[PDB]
Design a protein around this ligand. Structure first.
Ligand code: BCL
Ligand SMILES: CCCCCCCCCCCCCCCCCC(=O)OC[C@H](CO)OC(=O)CCCCCCCCCCCCCCCCC
Ligand SMILES: COC(C)(C)CCC/C(C)=C/C=C/C(C)=C/C=C/C(C)=C/C=C/C=C(C)/C=C/C=C(C)/C=C/C=C(\C)CCCC(C)(C)OC
Ligand SMILES: [Ca+2]
Lengths: 44, 84
């Protein structure tokens, strides 16, 4: 079960379907795994 | 002319109750319909901005070279559009 509420992104004309659906609790697992690495200072 | 003098006799085989009910219902239906047809037009008077606009106005979003809004480089969800 994915209990409500959700986040929906519309990606097309109205009344056509065409939208992406996110569960905030599942998307947190993808956010909690990215970890951009830290910069390395430019070289002389 | 005098050819219409006996029109009251109409009510001896057409009855008043059903006729009144039909007339009233039809007139209300027509009223609502015509107001909605004129609202969905150029003659709309609620939304014309005369004498003044009262709500904030729409703001457009800039597009990319593909004609759709630009993605934001660390957002965990893509950007919405309504046109494709
Ligand atoms: C900007 C105004 C809108 C408009 C907004 C509304 C709204 C809103 C309503 C009506 C309603 C009515 N309108 Mg109007 N109406 C418009 C234009 C017209 C025109 C036309 C030729 O342009 C006609 C014939 C009508 C006719 C009518 C009736 C069908 C109806 C009246 C109730 C009824 O039971 O009628 C029976 C009575 C008659 C048929 C006689 C009335 C005709 C009137 C006088 C129209 C004459 C206008 C026209 C310029 C005359 C040209 C002739 C000569 C050169 C002078 N409208 C314009 C487009 N109208 C109301 C309704 O449906 O109530 C139930 C209603 O709520
Ligand atoms: C043929 C079977 C038809 C069963 C009817 C459908 C029930 C859907 C689940 C509803 C539970 C909920 O509110 O949400 C559940 C959600 C949807 O999915 C989930 O998280 C589910 C996680 C596991 C739950 C599975 C149990 C199945 C038991 C159903 C009856 C026996 C078969
Ligand atoms: C007790 O008293 C007694 C009974 C003895 C005497 C009674 C006397 C009385 C009171 C008599 C009353 C008589 C009355 C009130 C009579 C009224 C008569 C009327 C108004 C008659 C009107 C008739 C109109 C007709 C038949 C029009 C017909 C139109 C047609 C068929 C059009 C067809 C058009 C088409 C198919 C075009 C389509 C267009 C398009 C483009 C939209 O189609 C796709
Ligand atoms: Ca106005």
């Amino acid at each position: 079960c994915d209990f409500p509420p959700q986040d929906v992104v519309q990606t097309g004309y109205r009344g056509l379907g065409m939208q992406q659906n996110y569960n905030p609790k599942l998307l947190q697992k993808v956010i909690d795994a990215t970890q951009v690495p830290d910069a390395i200072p430019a070289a002389t | 002319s005098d050819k219409f003098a006996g029109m009251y006799k109409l009510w001896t085989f057409i009855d008043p109750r059903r006729t009144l009910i039909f007339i009233v219902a039809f007139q209300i239906m027509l009223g609502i319909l015509i107001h909605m047809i004129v609202l969905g037009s150029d003659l709309n008077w609620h939304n014309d901005g005369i004498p003044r606009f009262y709500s904030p106005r729409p703001v457009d979003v800039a597009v990319g070279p593909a004609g759709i809004p630009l993605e934001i480089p660390g957002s965990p969800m893509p950007q919405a559009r309504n046109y494709n």
